[PDB]
Design a binder for these strands. Structure first.
Lengths: 775, 775
DNA sequence: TTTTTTTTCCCGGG
DNA sequence: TTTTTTTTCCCGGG
């Protein structure tokens, strides 16, 4: 019955699942598994709370289908970290029978090909490209199941409409243009008010349940009253020690065994509340017991001290007690340790802005939401229900809590957020029909014409009848026109064929809207190209961010004047000019009408490209944030996104027909991949030896600094003298004084100390002193 | 004794040599072979007339040394064609025992490496690079013999001083810096007046002989008197039919069996005298017999008719009789047939400017030199003795003749040219000692410092004592300075080390003087580079010719105005400007003082680069000479020299340290190699199908035009539609009308007929008509 | 005044 | 108002 053994599973699979400690299944799982003909063929849509085991049925169905019919499967997931964890889980579970679970998430590309794989775990945007390729090459029939998580994002999002672009396409191509269920689709949502309409569109069943192992109480508190539930008093809060009374609330939670989670509305605000709690804990417990261990807490200090960026000041006066912060201004490795400590004991109190609301699974006891207004706007209903989902620890306590501290002035705002479920899911396509067509519809029809699925306008009119007309119920004729004067398709006397620009957009998969910006940058490049410095090629591969940081305009104008002579020639060629910056940095704003749109996009990518230049040329990170307004967590994200963008413009140029430019872009992929050196780490222990001098000195020495570095002085000086490019140091018959000086200040030893010969004696003398201390 | 069998030779070698029909050897060969200790070790220098067998001793010595001691050998030869003939001779002779005779001449690079070879046949400039590489890599000891032909060119020439740069270097490095003869050197000259001084410098023997199988008489004729020899009358010339009386002189030669050779002082002049003789032959022999065959003469007409350039008008009215011309304004294949006919019968009379004076071996009977003044200057003594050397046919007649037609006004000019032997050989280095150092000395010391043979100035002072001080008998100190401010070597506190620019010059081996021009062109390129068209990359690989044609300045200014918008941007970047051409083309000349030297070199390479652009883009050769003042023989030479130059700038950039530019230059080596298509020849039989459309149409059709071309019209139109690069056809927010139009006139079908769709119907209709005629 | 995520791929014998 | 000559190199299994 409910026992896992009485369900027909492989022996190794059941043993592995019992190793985790799961034996029974809830009645709702069985009810939804035996709901109609979901088990054999057909599609399924259901919505269950996240606290209850939700992936049981999905894994059972995918295992059944894979073991019965040999066909590939997809496991589209929202984020990367959850995708990696799910990939590890699936591999460790199917590590015996043999599936070769492999993930496409992030830059972790598969070592093998898609054909050898059986189950692929991908993100939202890395499955659309896979399906597009499976359409371009006639191998679509390999697909046998598509599993989608978090279905309600298909309505409206920055990247959630890809589900609505993908599902209709696969269903139409597999069934409507071909004629049991050839492709099975299952989905998960969160208590949608119109879940029936989604199931009918996909021709599926419908199961809705509401069962949680822990019955949490959303005990909203206002002032001293704990008026909650249906506006009824349950308890009265007394003023404990104070200097809102937030500190008193965490005290009773801290006492017995429990923990607190504070959701700040700002990063800094997390820091402010973290130090405040730390003061009270030490105030009257070191001069009731605080109940914390000290053997492992001091060990954690060691890990936080060995990071290259070093420990943080606010992370030293609060970590000794169970207080810290987990905002986004931390290194991915540094922020991982804070999460690890909360996983089992040690730290007790925590703070966060939004990171632990979606992306990680860290349950705890009663959760404080603090103010009910975030960023000057009312809190979203979906966000509030997401935070309170993590207000219960499974298998330890019996009940959960969720106390929202709302000021007496507002009052009704908490009640409105307390009373409400969700909103109906829109289409994003609907918006306008006779007005300007949305960017989602333009990408919809262009992405099948390039694949050749639909050629005649009559055929494509059928396609639009399977995505939105049956969903919740001219535009096509106006959408075809937009693709015409923009040179995306070509028309004969009525058959449409892809052009070279249309094929380039699909292969690289940027967008049918931002491709018009990258194309204008590459076309302007083939009229003059600076080849001495590496800034003009760093401007064509810089990632395009809508808003990644508050671009300071006073500092940008300051760095504009101090640029060298050679690097100022790239600026005039790419488009950035001083006149625009004169109007800006003077309490200005954006504008419209085409021409002003190009000006803002040109200047925004230059500031990002300037930052990326310094990371290639060292410029230690402590001084990076001093000159450029940035953050430690933002710098790391830029490095990851720069490598992916460099290798994607290369595909754009290859399909476009331009072959000479492609070689230049492909050659630069090596330098942008920073990585971490391991063998060179021993050689990098020298003061005046950067990463660029390791390779040249490794050819001869390839040893430590004690005896290898103490081998003559002429050989060492000459070896590093010939590594630099030529860079002649005499004025030509057409150059200027500034041009030659920039060619003379580059050969100086760096940073930028003495002359060439003087550094040879300094390096040898410094090495001898270091050798004596070591020995 | 004199028999070849009694000399100790391999049986196969002697049988092969007897196959050619050579049995005995003259007494001078034995005398020079048994002269001192030349046979075992030591060096040899001798001078013999070219008519007598001169290579017997050289081949005997090289065979002896190779068969005795396993060591490589070199056979430096002046020209390429003679080098190829010598390579074929040596291979066919040593085709049995096993030597692997292989030549470096021209672009015919070896398939294997130098180590596997045993005997290498190289030109003058392709052995200096080999020796430089054998110095750079410590493998000099493989050399065991160096054979030099035409030694007297070492004195003064445009490229003859390389022998004086090479011999001293090898001798010094092998003997003076190391301590029997480790390396044996043999040489051939032509009756030098100071041959003793050359032998003592190389520490060799000396043999001088004067013996010719045919005793030619230099019967100079002036007016009607044949006053010759020591100014003595031998015969009186009577006036035969006339309209100088040049035609009458050839008549008696033509009659019995003999032939005539006329050395014109100009190309055209050869044409003028060729038609004149043809008129007289037909005048009174078709209305004594002319004595010529007609079966093979008509066959020769067929070969001259199938050339791509077609037959020549002046080559049709004189070829029916034994008259033609052999100037340099002919294709290498076309001019080969004329030489082949003269090899055995058929054609009897011939004309030439200088081609048959040095480079080919075509002996004949009495030779007429015509005027004794060439190009407004007195005839060179060496040139006159070179022409009369071919005034005797071996094995047919008994005596030769050489009649120089000198007008009665000059008279003494012929006597001075008749009485005289040669002039003493200079050094080219001597010229000036305290004055500006010659370009030969700068290259001399730079070429050993880079190799590291000499480091201290004391050591190098010894080097100059082995090349010229002992030859025919401050400069070194002034020569080192010139290499200093020009950044060719670097100096320490006295030891000199090569720089990056110095190593680049030796590897590519242009010159220590013209490298300063190529470097200034590449440095100017890394400040802006046009990547759309292929003219900016065609300007950096254009061969640098001192004077290859009379550059017309009126037409150059005309083509300057008609250039498109994109191609005029390259002109401003490279240096060519309208202002300079305004002063020129107005009865102007050259100038001096550095700045004017760069201006002339910039503009001269642009005219050559414009010509090379059309050859890549078809532009049939008949119209090539109409717009550009050129010649059929000059166009072919430009194509051969362009391919070699493209692959040599690549080596220059690799050693210089600039890696991004090297990739662009290396990618262009493929297009510059025109070649001849063989498989595509069948596909090229279509009117509207050039070489670029063969590859795209070969993917689908790959057949003839009868049935393969008659396969639908949409498929054919689309296939050639997508081959062109994108080349968008809409004006951008920053472009101009002219820029867009140049992007719209390129997609038109070419040439440059109807629109894109119209050509599809025209091609199909034209193919059907051609198919009907064939079938 | 916070939270994310695209691309194709070379090395060994010669 | 004619006659010449430099350079290093990739393709197959995956």
């Amino acid at each position: 019955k409910l026992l896992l053994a009485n369900w027909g599973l492989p022996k190794a699979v059941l043993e592995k699942y019992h190793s985790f400690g799961v034996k029974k299944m809830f009645e709702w799982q069985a009810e939804c598994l035996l709901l109609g003909q979901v088990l054999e063929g057909k599609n399924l849509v259901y919505s269950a709370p996240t606290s209850a085991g939700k992936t049981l049925v999905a894994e059972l169905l995918i295992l059944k289908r894979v073991l019965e019919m040999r066909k590939k499967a997809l496991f589209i997931l929202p984020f990367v970290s959850v995708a990696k964890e799910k990939k590890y889980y699936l591999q460790s579970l199917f590590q015996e029978v043999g599936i070769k679970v492999d993930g496409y998430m992030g830059s972790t590309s598969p070592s093998r090909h898609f054909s050898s794989l059986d189950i692929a775990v991908c993100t939202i945007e890395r499955a659309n490209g896979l399906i597009n390729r499976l359409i371009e090459e006639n191998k679509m029939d390999l697909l046998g199941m598509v599993v989608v998580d978090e279905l309600h994002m298909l309505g409206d999002s920055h990247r959630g409409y890809l589900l609505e672009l993908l599902l209709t396409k696969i269903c139409y191509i597999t069934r409507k243009s071909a004629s049991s269920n050839a492709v099975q689709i299952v989905g998960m949502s969160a208590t949608l008010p119109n879940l029936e309409l989604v199931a009918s569109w996909l021709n599926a069943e419908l199961y809705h349940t509401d069962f949680r192992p822990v019955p949490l109480l959303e005990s909203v508190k206002v002032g001293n009253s704990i008026y909650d539930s249906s506006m009824k008093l349950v308890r009265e809060f007394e003023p404990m020690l104070q200097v809102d009374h937030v500190v008193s609330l965490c005290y009773e939670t801290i006492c017995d065994n429990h923990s607190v989670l504070l959701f700040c509305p700002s990063k800094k605000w997390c820091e402010k509340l973290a130090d405040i709690i730390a003061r009270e804990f030490y105030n009257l417990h070191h001069q009731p017991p605080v109940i914390l261990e000290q053997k492992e807490l001091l060990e954690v200090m060691d890990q936080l001290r060995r990071l290259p960026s070093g420990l943080d000041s606010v992370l030293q006066k609060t970590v000794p007690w169970g207080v810290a912060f987990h905002h986004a201004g931390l290194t991915f490795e540094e922020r991982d340790i804070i999460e690890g400590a909360f996983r089992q004991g040690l730290i007790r109190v925590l703070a966060a802005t939004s990171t632990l609301s979606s992306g990680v699974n860290l349950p705890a006891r009663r959760v404080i939401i603090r103010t009910p207004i975030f960023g000057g706007r009312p809190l979203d209903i979906l966000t509030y229900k997401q935070m309170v989902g993590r207000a219960g620890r499974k298998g330890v306590d019996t009940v959960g809590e969720s106390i929202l501290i709302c000021k007496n002035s507002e009052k009704s705002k908490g009640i409105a957020l307390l009373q409400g479920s969700l909103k109906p899911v829109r289409s994003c396509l609907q918006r306008r029909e006779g007005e300007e067509v949305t960017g989602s519809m333009i990408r919809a029809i262009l992405e099948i014409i390039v694949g050749g699925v639909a050629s005649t306008s009559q055929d494509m009119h059928t396609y639009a009848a399977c995505t939105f007309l049956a969903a919740s119920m001219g535009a096509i004729e106006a959408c075809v026109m937009w693709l015409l004067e923009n040179e995306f398709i070509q028309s004969t006397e009525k058959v449409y064929h892809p052009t070279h620009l249309g094929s380039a957009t699909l292969s690289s998969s940027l967008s049918p809207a931002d491709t018009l910006d990258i194309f204008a940058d590459l076309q302007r490049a083939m009229k003059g190209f600076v080849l001495e410095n590496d800034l003009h090629i760093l401007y064509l591969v810089t990632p395009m961010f809508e808003d990644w940081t508050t671009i300071d305009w006073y500092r940008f104008f300051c760095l504009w004047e101090k640029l060298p002579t050679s690097m100022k020639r790239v600026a005039e060629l790419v488009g950035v000019e001083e006149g625009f910056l004169a109007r800006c940095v003077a309490a200005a704003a954006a504008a419209a009408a085409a021409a002003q749109h190009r000006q803002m996009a040109i200047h925004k990518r230059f500031f990002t490209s300037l930052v990326l230049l310094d990371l290639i040329s060292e410029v230690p990170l402590r001084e990076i944030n001093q000159k450029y307004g940035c953050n430690r967590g933002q710098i790391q994200s830029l490095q990851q996104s720069a490598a992916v963008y460099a290798g994607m413009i290369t595909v754009f140029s290859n399909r476009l027909g331009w072959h000479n430019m492609e070689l230049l872009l492909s050659q630069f992929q090596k330098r942008l991949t920073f990585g971490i050196q391991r063998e060179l780490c021993d050689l990098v222990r020298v003061s005046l030896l950067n990463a660029q001098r390791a390779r040249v000195l490794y050819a001869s020495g390839f040893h430590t600094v004690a005896d290898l570095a103490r081998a003559n002085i002429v050989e060492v000086e000459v070896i590093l003298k010939n590594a630099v490019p030529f860079k002649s140091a005499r004025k030509a018959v057409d150059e200027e004084e500034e041009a030659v000086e920039e060619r003379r200040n580059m050969r100086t030893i760096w940073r930028k100390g003495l002359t060439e010969r003087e550094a040879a004696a300094l390096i040898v003398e410094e090495a001898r002193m270091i050798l004596q201390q070591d020995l």
